[PDB]
Design a protein around this motif. Structure first.
Motif, mmCIF file in Angstrom:
data_model
loop_
_atom_site.group_PDB
_atom_site.id
_atom_site.type_symbol
_atom_site.label_atom_id
_atom_site.label_comp_id
_atom_site.label_asym_id
_atom_site.label_seq_id
_atom_site.Cartn_x
_atom_site.Cartn_y
_atom_site.Cartn_z
ATOM 1 N N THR A 373 22.247 -22.962 21.589
ATOM 2 C CA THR A 373 23.073 -23.998 22.263
ATOM 3 C C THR A 373 23.557 -25.019 21.232
ATOM 4 O OG1 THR A 373 21.081 -25.200 22.859
ATOM 5 C CG2 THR A 373 21.977 -23.744 24.542
ATOM 6 N N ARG A 374 24.591 -25.775 21.593
ATOM 7 C CA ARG A 374 25.220 -26.817 20.744
ATOM 8 C C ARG A 374 24.189 -27.907 20.410
ATOM 9 N NH1 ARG A 374 29.035 -31.164 21.628
ATOM 10 N NH2 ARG A 374 28.544 -30.942 23.849
ATOM 11 N N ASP A 375 23.172 -28.088 21.260
ATOM 12 C CA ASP A 375 22.135 -29.149 21.138
ATOM 13 C C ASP A 375 21.064 -28.756 20.114
ATOM 14 N N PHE A 381 31.697 -33.755 17.908
ATOM 15 C CA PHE A 381 32.973 -34.276 17.357
ATOM 16 C C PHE A 381 33.151 -35.710 17.869
ATOM 17 C CE2 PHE A 381 37.677 -34.509 17.400
ATOM 18 C CZ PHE A 381 38.029 -33.937 16.199
ATOM 19 N N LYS A 382 33.364 -36.674 16.967
ATOM 20 C CA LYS A 382 33.425 -38.119 17.316
ATOM 21 C C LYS A 382 34.588 -38.792 16.578
ATOM 22 C CE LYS A 382 29.989 -38.031 20.155
ATOM 23 N NZ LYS A 382 30.472 -36.661 20.443
ATOM 24 N N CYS A 383 35.312 -39.676 17.269
ATOM 25 C CA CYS A 383 36.328 -40.577 16.665
ATOM 26 C C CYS A 383 35.600 -41.691 15.909
ATOM 27 C CB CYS A 383 37.252 -41.168 17.722
ATOM 28 S SG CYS A 383 38.508 -42.270 17.020
ATOM 29 N N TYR B 177 33.176 -25.887 28.235
ATOM 30 C CA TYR B 177 34.218 -25.253 27.376
ATOM 31 C C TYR B 177 33.792 -25.307 25.900
ATOM 32 C CZ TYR B 177 39.048 -23.498 26.727
ATOM 33 O OH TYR B 177 40.147 -22.742 26.459
ATOM 34 N N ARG B 178 33.429 -26.493 25.400
ATOM 35 C CA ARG B 178 33.096 -26.719 23.965
ATOM 36 C C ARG B 178 31.713 -26.140 23.646
ATOM 37 N NH1 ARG B 178 33.125 -33.098 23.750
ATOM 38 N NH2 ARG B 178 34.709 -32.574 25.320
ATOM 39 N N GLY B 179 30.840 -26.043 24.657
ATOM 40 C CA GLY B 179 29.410 -25.714 24.509
ATOM 41 C C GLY B 179 29.125 -24.219 24.583
ATOM 42 N N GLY B 221 40.720 -23.805 41.665
ATOM 43 C CA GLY B 221 40.077 -24.669 40.653
ATOM 44 C C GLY B 221 40.711 -26.048 40.628
ATOM 45 N N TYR B 222 39.980 -27.054 40.146
ATOM 46 C CA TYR B 222 40.480 -28.448 40.035
ATOM 47 C C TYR B 222 39.717 -29.194 38.937
ATOM 48 C CZ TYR B 222 36.641 -31.373 41.628
ATOM 49 O OH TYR B 222 35.456 -32.046 41.709
ATOM 50 N N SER B 223 40.299 -30.302 38.473
ATOM 51 C CA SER B 223 39.617 -31.363 37.688
ATOM 52 C C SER B 223 40.244 -32.718 38.024
ATOM 53 C CB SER B 223 39.664 -31.081 36.209
ATOM 54 O OG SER B 223 38.877 -32.026 35.497
ATOM 55 N N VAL B 256 39.770 -41.522 39.029
ATOM 56 C CA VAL B 256 39.579 -41.665 37.556
ATOM 57 C C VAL B 256 38.081 -41.790 37.265
ATOM 58 C CG1 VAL B 256 39.908 -44.194 37.514
ATOM 59 C CG2 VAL B 256 40.356 -42.843 35.459
ATOM 60 N N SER B 257 37.576 -40.938 36.368
ATOM 61 C CA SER B 257 36.212 -41.012 35.786
ATOM 62 C C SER B 257 36.282 -41.836 34.500
ATOM 63 C CB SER B 257 35.657 -39.633 35.537
ATOM 64 O OG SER B 257 34.592 -39.676 34.603
ATOM 65 N N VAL B 258 35.424 -42.846 34.347
ATOM 66 C CA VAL B 258 35.405 -43.731 33.144
ATOM 67 C C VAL B 258 33.970 -43.820 32.614
ATOM 68 C CG1 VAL B 258 35.998 -46.012 32.205
ATOM 69 C CG2 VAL B 258 37.412 -45.004 34.014
ATOM 70 N N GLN B 334 26.888 -37.893 37.020
ATOM 71 C CA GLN B 334 25.851 -37.623 35.995
ATOM 72 C C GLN B 334 26.255 -36.344 35.252
ATOM 73 O OE1 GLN B 334 24.071 -38.258 33.603
ATOM 74 N NE2 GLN B 334 22.388 -39.281 34.655
ATOM 75 N N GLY B 335 26.910 -36.505 34.097
ATOM 76 C CA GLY B 335 27.437 -35.402 33.271
ATOM 77 C C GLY B 335 26.556 -35.110 32.069
ATOM 78 N N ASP B 336 25.362 -35.715 32.004
ATOM 79 C CA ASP B 336 24.404 -35.577 30.875
ATOM 80 C C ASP B 336 23.037 -35.108 31.388
ATOM 81 O OD1 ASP B 336 23.763 -35.980 27.987
ATOM 82 O OD2 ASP B 336 22.253 -37.350 28.858
HETATM 83 O O1 LIG Z 1 34.159 -37.112 34.161
HETATM 84 C C1 LIG Z 1 34.751 -36.035 34.083
HETATM 85 N N1 LIG Z 1 35.083 -35.480 32.892
HETATM 86 C C2 LIG Z 1 34.838 -36.154 31.622
HETATM 87 C C3 LIG Z 1 33.547 -35.771 30.936
HETATM 88 C C4 LIG Z 1 33.475 -35.686 29.552
HETATM 89 C C5 LIG Z 1 32.280 -35.390 28.919
HETATM 90 C C6 LIG Z 1 31.121 -35.164 29.651
HETATM 91 C C7 LIG Z 1 29.803 -34.861 28.985
HETATM 92 O O2 LIG Z 1 29.871 -35.140 27.571
HETATM 93 C C8 LIG Z 1 29.691 -33.922 26.815
HETATM 94 C C9 LIG Z 1 30.591 -33.948 25.607
HETATM 95 O O3 LIG Z 1 30.067 -34.925 24.681
HETATM 96 P P1 LIG Z 1 29.522 -34.441 23.231
HETATM 97 O O4 LIG Z 1 30.695 -33.682 22.603
HETATM 98 O O5 LIG Z 1 28.306 -33.600 23.409
HETATM 99 O O6 LIG Z 1 29.215 -35.696 22.430
HETATM 100 C C10 LIG Z 1 29.936 -32.802 27.817
HETATM 101 O O7 LIG Z 1 29.257 -31.602 27.463
HETATM 102 C C11 LIG Z 1 29.339 -33.401 29.085
HETATM 103 O O8 LIG Z 1 27.920 -33.314 29.059
HETATM 104 C C12 LIG Z 1 31.199 -35.237 31.033
HETATM 105 C C13 LIG Z 1 32.391 -35.537 31.665
HETATM 106 N N2 LIG Z 1 35.087 -35.261 35.172
HETATM 107 C C14 LIG Z 1 34.802 -35.486 36.546
HETATM 108 C C15 LIG Z 1 35.012 -34.434 37.431
HETATM 109 C C16 LIG Z 1 34.613 -34.536 38.754
HETATM 110 C C17 LIG Z 1 34.006 -35.699 39.196
HETATM 111 S S1 LIG Z 1 33.415 -35.799 40.855
HETATM 112 O O9 LIG Z 1 32.862 -34.521 41.210
HETATM 113 O O10 LIG Z 1 32.583 -36.967 40.966
HETATM 114 C C18 LIG Z 1 34.856 -36.064 41.837
HETATM 115 C C19 LIG Z 1 35.669 -34.991 42.156
HETATM 116 C C20 LIG Z 1 36.814 -35.209 42.902
HETATM 117 C C21 LIG Z 1 37.144 -36.482 43.319
HETATM 118 C C22 LIG Z 1 36.328 -37.545 42.999
HETATM 119 C C23 LIG Z 1 35.174 -37.347 42.259
HETATM 120 C C24 LIG Z 1 33.819 -36.767 38.334
HETATM 121 C C25 LIG Z 1 34.214 -36.656 37.013
#
Ligand SMILES: O=C(NCc1ccc([C@@H]2O[C@H](COP(=O)(O)O)[C@@H](O)[C@H]2O)cc1)Nc1ccc(S(=O)(=O)c2ccccc2)cc1
Ligand SMILES: O=C(NCc1ccc([C@@H]2O[C@H](COP(=O)(O)O)[C@@H](O)[C@H]2O)cc1)Nc1ccc(S(=O)(=O)c2ccccc2)cc1
Lengths: 465, 465
Positions: A373-375, A381-383, B177-179, B221-223, B256-258, B334-336
């Motif tokens: 895995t990448r971990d 990749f970072k700005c 995708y990247r992982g 599919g969606y994002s 928007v996700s921030v 929670q994306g981590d």
């Molecule tokens: O937030 C985003 N993407 C951005 C993004 C970017 C990066 C990451 C994390 O960071 C990692 C990359 O970082 P490194 O390279 O490892 O340093 C990656 O592997 C992952 O772990 C996670 C997310 N998309 C998104 C998608 C759906 C929802 S929802 O389901 O809440 C929802 C759906 C529909 C309407 C409302 C709400 C909310 C948010």
């Protein structure tokens, strides 16, 4: 066929709108963030040549992107303007500069390995767009690194028990073809393994090497004639001896691997190989040995009991290091339950029972090419640097809960230290010239590969001490 | 382009010479050998269409194989005769029959899922030649299965805390995708995830679905628009608030996700979102909510502290199940650090602090699409039946040290039991017709796909109870 406009994390489509206004430069870097203390840098050249170089933008690919992203977001969020610019201005050549350490270079953790920046102020957004595809370099890096660590263990124990490293590059075979996620992954994985060894059953690995790197080696990859369970079991439960006899006679003049654990590994070694067909083994050439393949039980316990049985039925010598050696016409392959952890346990157990490592070679599949895995090396990749309103700004993340996720600040360079170690200089401090030349080289600029390496250069750079 | 003659474990080249003389049939089966008690069968149709169907043998591909294998073995071991036969007799169409359970079928462990046999007695060798490429179906099977298990956990806790499963199919996003190890792996992985969910940032996943399966769903599919650290950090350490304000205003009318953990997640939620920019959040539509993305610290502890902070700054309701609900314009991703194991811990901890699962959606990358192996479900291909001298022989392996590696005997069929469970009948006992029709169907025969499934059929078959 391939559309680099689609080959990004889909959310990056919106990032041109998110950067601070009047941003002319986005500068970003890849590192194996801070056990794998040092990493092999391999695979970027494959990605640069396959996906990024030449005319990668067309009117058709811009139109495809517009349609694909409109559906995906249910909103016209894809921006044609930036891609139409690159098409019209540079004939679809990406205006980015990529600097990187030489392919095959062994670099300690926490060091800049490659950097990306836009060469046209209009394409500030492009640096971040290609993160996703460049980050996939984690895989050939991680496979090359993990494979090299397994080579170190084999090197230590082969030298200890034999007094030389003869045939070290044939001691760990890639059996991973079926155990990986795709055909493309199999090719990339095999080529990353072949940085360190020559044994693979994935010929696509050699084809990838010849096409994207090139080699003066006439035999960069190899495999041996071998049985599977199907070619033994097909004879019937009562005809295992007949299967063995047929296969060793059909491959009398070449090396043949014969899986021997179909029913009873210990019966097969002692009664079939060691008694019934002994006369067909002891007559075999040193260039055409029988290789017995166990494939079940505790890996170490099975190896020791097999060698004990073969020792009782075939003449064992003691080499100049005082370690037992099977006859040159007889060897073993442990193709089951081998990974970085177990490999260590097996050669140690072999050493403790005074069996030379030259008796047993190893094979790995999923653990070699898939269970990474990448971990593992924390590849990210970072700005680190942006220019906004013509002013340079050193940028970084620093999450309060995790210092390990802190990224480097500003323009980066890699340097040898006086004592022969490595340092990444931040905030453009490379410009002070207190160390030597930056070790990174421009490998990509404005759609062209500017610096390239042969697989011979990769192998030399990736060598053990 | 792709050469199926090269797309095998290289040692299989020698196997035609190893089978018992006068073998007219080789019959082999794939199973997920006997916690993942049931598996989703998905991905075979992709392999059959992409690699195996139509004219897959040419004079050029036979000549390429001869050259590639001559070097690889340093011996002319590749047999042109068998491939020249298939070319001349069937216009390069593979004379094999493949039977399989319908795509998307949920089948318990230890059951026949597909079988392969030659249709021409001259091509007995071909059945096990294509093992390697067919076995790679482990990946879309394992991704589809692991994703569905995560859906079960989300289903249980969403129902418990809200009283419905509204939006369940949007609760786990593919960020992989990247992982993953390759572009091809990213596509296959994304499509396997999309059996269960609609969220991916890999558009190649949807392209794979439309091309190899097809769908009547207008939005398979969606994002969502989302920030990364780069689009926040680029503003400078002192301008985090400015970055937030710019992005939510630029995406005022869409979700928007921030990412909010660049410097201090808790400062960002309490002082920036909860005070400074509160007025720009509470004015937002239910269709266009702010999604706060933490990305560091202990996953559960971070989620609970974020919800506690947002609860103190935004109006919290209590739903009819007595669980706290954020306002409709505010949510968390929670994306981590999300995988099958941690997902369970997080929703449980959320339930114990009386927070509805409606408040938090999830994302996974490497753990979703990369940190999976063939041994997870023990996906393997085994010869169970051969005809030699016109006589059927039931074949199997049975290693003395590992009963779990015992393979099934003879001609196989899959049946519903009276109580609604599954049984694999061995030794052709399906012919007794005690258990109704074999559930396996002919999907491939003599170079043609004979039975196909839409992605709509796959999704329906792969549904939860
Ligand atoms: O937030 C985003 N993407 C951005 C993004 C970017 C990066 C990451 C994390 O960071 C990692 C990359 O970082 P490194 O390279 O490892 O340093 C990656 O592997 C992952 O772990 C996670 C997310 N998309 C998104 C998608 C759906 C929802 S929802 O389901 O809440 C929802 C759906 C529909 C309407 C409302 C709400 C909310 C948010
Ligand atoms: O024996 C073979 N291949 C056959 C083969 C087939 C299968 C396997 C194992 O079985 C698994 C597949 O089974 P499932 O599908 O999981 O049920 C696979 O993942 C792997 O773990 C291992 C090996 N090759 C080989 C290569 C080199 C050596 S040598 O280095 O000793 C040597 C080199 C040169 C001259 C002399 C000696 C010896 C042997």
């Amino acid at each position: 066929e391939f559309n680099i406009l689609l080959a990004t994390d889909s959310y990056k489509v919106t990032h041109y709108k998110q950067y601070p206004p009047n941003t002319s430069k986005v500068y970003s870097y890849f590192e194996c963030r801070e056990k794998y203390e040092e990493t092999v840098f391999y695979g970027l050249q494959y990605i640069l040549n396959k996906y990024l170089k030449g005319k990668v933008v067309t009117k058709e690919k811009i139109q495809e992107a517009k349609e694909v992203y409109r559906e995906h977001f249910q909103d016209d969020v894809f921006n044609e303007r930036g891609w139409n610019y690159i098409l019209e201005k540079y004939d679809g050549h990406l205006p980015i500069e990529v600097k990187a350490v030489p392919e095959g270079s062994v670099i300690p953790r926490g060091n800049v390995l490659f950097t990306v920046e836009n060469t046209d102020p209009e394409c500030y957004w492009l640096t971040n767009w290609i993160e996703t595809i460049l980050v996939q370099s984690w895989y050939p890096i991680t496979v090359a690194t993990n494979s090299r660590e397994q080579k170190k263990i084999l090197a230590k124990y082969l030298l200890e028990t034999s007094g030389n490293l003869d045939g070290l590059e044939y001691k760990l075979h890639d059996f991973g073809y079926r155990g990986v996620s795709s055909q493309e992954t199999a090719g990339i994985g095999a080529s990353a393994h072949l940085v360190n060894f020559k044994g693979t059953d994935t010929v696509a690995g050699i084809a990838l090497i010849k096409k994207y790197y090139g080699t003066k080696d006439p035999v960069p990859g190899y495999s041996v004639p071998a049985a599977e369970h199907s070619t033994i079991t097909a004879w019937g439960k009562d005809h295992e001896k007949d299967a063995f006899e047929h296969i060793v006679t059909q491959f009398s003049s070449v090396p043949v691997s014969v899986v021997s654990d179909s029913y009873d590994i210990y019966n097969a070694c002692e009664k079939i190989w060691g008694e019934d067909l002994r006369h067909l083994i002891v007559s075999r050439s040193t260039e055409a040995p029988l290789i017995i393949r166990p494939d079940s039980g505790n890996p170490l316990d099975t190896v020791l009991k097999v060698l004990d049985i073969l020792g009782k039925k075939f003449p064992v010598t003691e080499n100049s290091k005082g370690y037992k050696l099977l006859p040159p016409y007889l060897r073993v392959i442990q193709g089951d339950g081998v990974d970085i952890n177990t490999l260590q346990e097996i050669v140690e157990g072999m050493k403790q029972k005074k069996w030379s490592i030259e008796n047993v070679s190893f094979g790995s599949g999923g653990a070699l090419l898939q269970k990474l895995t990448r971990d593992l090396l924390n590849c990210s990749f970072k700005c680190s640097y942006v220019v906004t309103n013509g002013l340079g700004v050193n940028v970084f993340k620093d999450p309060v809960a995790d210092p390990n996720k802190r990224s480097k600040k500003g323009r980066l360079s890699l340097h040898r230290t006086p004592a022969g170690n490595f340092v990444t200089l931040e905030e453009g401090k490379g410009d002070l010239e207190e160390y030597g030349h930056d070790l990174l080289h421009t490998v990509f600029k404005n759609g062209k590969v500017t610096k390239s390496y042969s697989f011979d250069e990769v192998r030399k750079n990736a060598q053990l001490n």
